[PDB]
Amino acid sequence: KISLRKLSKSVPVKLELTGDKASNVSSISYSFDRGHVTIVGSQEAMDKIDSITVPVDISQVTEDTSKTLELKAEGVTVQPSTVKVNLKVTQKLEHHHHHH
Numbered sequence: 001k002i003s004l005r006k007l008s009k010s011v012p013v014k015l016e017l018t019g020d021k022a023s024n025v026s027s028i029s030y031s032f033d034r035g036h037v038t039i040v041g042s043q044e045a046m047d048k049i050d051s052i053t054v055p056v057d058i059s060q061v062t063e064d065t066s067k068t069l070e071l072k073a074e075g076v077t078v079q080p081s082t083v084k085v086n087l088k089v090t091q092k093l094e095h096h097h098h099h100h
Contacts, residue, residue, distance in 0.1 A: 007041075009046050018055045019058045032084070056087070061087055061089060
């Protein structure tokens with residue numbers, strides 16, 4: 001029954017773009033310094049969590065910036081549960097048409 005009562009695992013974060021893309025933006029990208037955090041709790045809870053979804057609104061995003069996002073899950077203790085995310089915005093600009 002496992003005498004020990006201590007365990008830790010890693011759950012990569014998955015960002016899902018939510019909202020309509022700005023008409024003045026061709027495309028948006030995102031990155032992370034680690035994109036991985038340590039969780040502590042029962043093995044059953046860990047087996048249930050395969051990853052942490054972190055949705056972000058891009059509709060209000062029209063310029064390059066970064067925001068701190070806190071992660072929480074019921075059944076495990078997420079810590080530091082904080083990561084920095086940089087959102088680069090690409091400005092649309094016409095150019096020479098592709099010959100191909």
